[PDB]
Amino acid sequence: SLRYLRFLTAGESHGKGLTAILEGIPANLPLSEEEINHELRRRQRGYGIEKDTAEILSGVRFGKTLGSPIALFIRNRDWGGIKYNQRDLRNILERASARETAARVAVGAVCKKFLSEFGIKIGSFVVSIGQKEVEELKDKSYFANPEKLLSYHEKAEDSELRIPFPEKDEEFKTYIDEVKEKGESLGGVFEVFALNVPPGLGSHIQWDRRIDGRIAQAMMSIQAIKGVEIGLGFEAARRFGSQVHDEIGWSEGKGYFRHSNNLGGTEGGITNGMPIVVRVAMKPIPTIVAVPAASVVGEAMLAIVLADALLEKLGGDFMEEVKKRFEDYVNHVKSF
């Protein structure tokens, strides 16, 4: 459950389409269908007219948000059972199917646009598919390196499997087919990150306000996701406090920061100022690798949580107002 933003999605996999209504994004935010469609396209190319497109039904005029609810519709074009008493599990799968994640990505696309206005960037990349892992990423020191993270995301965009090293593509494509010929499905793991998130988002005062918990629900709620780690995660539970602890640093023109990021950008339920890093595990599908698409949905979920948490801290009804409060707050952080 979000604290500031509100949204609902609807639609069955084989129905007229998917509908979503997002409320809470401030007024005067430049927003276009192309920005939304771009994200929908990344998710589509993650499974391996046909292109998903969203039509804005309200909330936007002359390229800017009005401040009113934003409604989107995604045509399908190709146009549980016990709990709801549905003998035909089709009615259950229709709505359950990962088809619904497309609406999540559309809502997330709006949140990403909102976040970018504050210089906040979200990205991701696959680190393992089946038993084959991206060995270059076993050392997690890059969790504290914005340039590297961004670098890996950029390369993932040039990968048919969204892996940080496209050259490895052919190699991975081999292992995959080598497995799909044995009538076997594959799972995977990806990492999602957010850069330039100021310290102070989320809160330690109540269990449900902790940023980590919120991130956890958003990620684990994605279909097929069975595991989630913030930063080092389970590996951190096997190490010594000293080999996990992120050393605190400070500078005159920068304020406080950390020398490493094993915590994944959060400390005691609140963001660190360091990159937010989340590791997500997707179990093998059914029985067309889906981990790449999953990672794109992961970015959408993280953008929703962060946009929500940022608005919770800043408040505001129009961009000029929110941006001013962000600037004052960041100034307060730097000089603390």
Added chain:
Amino acid sequence: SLRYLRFLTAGESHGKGLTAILEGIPANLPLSEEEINHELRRRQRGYKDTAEILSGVRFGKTLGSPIALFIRNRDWADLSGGIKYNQRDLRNILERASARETAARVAVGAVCKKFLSEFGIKIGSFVVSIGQKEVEELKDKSYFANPEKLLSYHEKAEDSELRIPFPEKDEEFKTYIDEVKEKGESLGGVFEVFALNVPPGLGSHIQWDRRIDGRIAQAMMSIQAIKGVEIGLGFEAARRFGSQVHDEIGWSEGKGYFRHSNNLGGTEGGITNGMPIVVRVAMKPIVAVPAASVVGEAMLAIVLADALLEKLGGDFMEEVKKRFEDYVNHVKSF
């Protein structure tokens, strides 16, 4: 957050005490302070604490009104929180962020456990690793589908000083801990929490925030020092073939639907499937993992009590239990 129950905790680590208010538990539920104190003691034992019921209970039974609890303090997030709340006197945040707050959580959880027991639902847990030392016997997770095994591990854990399923290894672990403590070092750990006899159908796939897996993930990860959470096999499942993770569906007269394995941890597509709910939680170093496991039980009880009430609704046990029976028969007879 929750979908049916509502609660809030308050109090600083070194203040007068911890306060908690829980709303939504049906009326006529036998409840006593000992049942609460029992859980509070298990928490401290994992590293004197009692709770006084201030309202919501009369003649040993809930009135259906809000239940207020107070845990008197006998001895009467840092930095980021300091920046966040403009608190120069850092102790102002550390005070509320302290794991002492988890005591109020366990207090609330205790009431939820009692509620759940009325339906035969049992919650338990045990530590599987501390630092680099793991309980090798528990390496194979086949026991995720075995209610008897899970329960026995919990029971034995209650006799372990570190809540490990094999008390005879306490010295082997204690030596390791004392050893790491010899140096200037702290340790984290990993525990598994489970719920038995939970009916399929809890939670929902209709909306991302209603899926039971996300709700379990938030509750668990909201616990102090927790940095990782898995439902069932977890990250391990992500590395296997589809056929090695799949929990084949089985059915028999009377027993109804069930699964031959539980790599999924008791949930499928955002809803409980009838199998034991199993959650793996990773705690980073700050020893404290045993107390964390107890807190994990409380969080799981709260999420499940909430999910059960969301499905059944009702204002008094008699009413809620009748609905449970009809639903269960509906499940089997499906």
Added chain:
Amino acid sequence: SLRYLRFLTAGESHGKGLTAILEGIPANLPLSEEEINHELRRRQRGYKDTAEILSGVRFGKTLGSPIALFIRNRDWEADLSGGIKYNQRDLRNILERASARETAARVAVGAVCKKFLSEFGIKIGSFVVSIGQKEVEELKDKSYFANPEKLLSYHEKAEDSELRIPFPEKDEEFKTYIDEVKEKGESLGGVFEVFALNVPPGLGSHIQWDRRIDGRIAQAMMSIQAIKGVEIGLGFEAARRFGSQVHDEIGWSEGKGYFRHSNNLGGTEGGITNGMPIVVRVAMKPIVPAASVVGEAMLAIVLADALLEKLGGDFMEEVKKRFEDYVNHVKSF
């Protein structure tokens, strides 16, 4: 807000159309676009509108998933406070969403809740009680608040009235008066009453301020554009009379259980419904028949929410069975 149901509406007055998403209605509830349009039309006559079901319904029945509706604004070919609030220099951006046109989406959502409610024998209706200084005299005495037959009858006649007044015969007196005031540079507001029949006792709760059914109905009604006043039962009049005068004496009978001899309380006691007709009086300031139709929708939403809150359930059969078990429990208490 709501305790079980969840919904959101969107759309600008002159945009492409109105959108709404409703979540929480049980599966297997018969639902058609015609049942929705029926209400949408009643709303317009209060001053075409057609709703397309985009999801949640298959083979005429609800799937249990979210129900999305779209009301296409076919001719697609206040202000200051919102302008300041949202930094909207062009106040049209505030007007487009604030417009009473938005109420159509609320009526569409309400229509679904009405159908859900009807599956339980619960009926929702309304009628106009006054417009300007002209009030319906025959209804001065509020004794009919405890008479389901009368309330239902007044609603029926209203359905034949151009201004939804409970006495079609008075249509001309009202229309004439309206034209007179309209002949001048003036506009009128009005009062209407909304009721719900066959609602069981126990809906809502007294344990927490935000769960009391009276506060929930009040927000729903007052949220309607131009509504400045709301009362449950006698309302402000009850505040003027003596205790013994407003008090609804409790009655009981073998084959009917507990009930009340009068309904000055409007079907609510201490935060809970008491079994009597739920009656709400609503005041709309100048610039009412259409508003009364919106009032029905809002009361349907709140009651459907309160019903599901008490019963739970994911499919009609399940809910209806818990209903019967609950009602029997009430009678034999």
Added chain:
Amino acid sequence: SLRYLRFLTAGESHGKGLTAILEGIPANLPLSEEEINHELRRRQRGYKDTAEILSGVRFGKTLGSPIALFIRNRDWADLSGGIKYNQRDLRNILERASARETAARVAVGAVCKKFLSEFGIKIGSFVVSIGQKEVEELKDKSYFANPEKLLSYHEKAEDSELRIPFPEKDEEFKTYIDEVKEKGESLGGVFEVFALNVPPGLGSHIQWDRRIDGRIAQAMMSIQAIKGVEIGLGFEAARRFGSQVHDEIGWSEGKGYFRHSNNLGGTEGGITNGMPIVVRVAMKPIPTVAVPAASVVGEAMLAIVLADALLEKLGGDFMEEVKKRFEDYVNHVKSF
């Protein structure tokens, strides 16, 4: 209900006492038990209650954490509730339903009032009628647009044993009441609660549940015995012509944009307009004169709603932060 603040109250009429937890009040707000007790006393005189702060306050200031309050119970409807919760002993319902619960609401309301005072927002009320007897001088509601008059009526009311704006009429009302008492009768009443210096922009028109009027209506109508609520003129406005109801808009250099009258009650289109917020509340006869006490609870409820709406608009975790945003916003208002 609320969108920013969160709180819960608990306790039975004759139990050990009343408990409450309020979350969301910013850090560094001066707060003492006497500020709370003062409000608790006003309530008692409306028919020594004292609250004990158990957390959320250190050195006279809020820490930013949840605020817990306990109100001792020294002495340490029913049917519908008895049926709903299957309680054969109707004393189990009366104990919680009892207007005794309002004491907890007033304690919560006190903290909110203090918060609101930091911004110059003032909340008050006064009784306008008891039984068939109403304060004639208040028949004309033109004083809704007069901050000074309203405040005056409230101060005068504080000198009345029936919180009526005209203390001289006390004996007059006392007798009338006494006469009604003789023939074994109970009386209801009508009071008006106002809020001064509230800026335009609180609440929203974008979604039904965000509109300020609706939020005020639930808060008020949720008070025991309340059967009616009006914002401004109310039902009387429904009986008037548009021109004799609408508040014409005026503009000036200072405090730009204002209204010439306040028939609307300080809200329009679901948003506060800067004018005084005025609510008229009707309380039925209890059971088969508590209207003065009811007015004090009405104040607490309006304060909670407004503090929540103000926080919703401003956001913020500490007072210095919230105050600058308020200043900036008001600056935006005056120059719009």
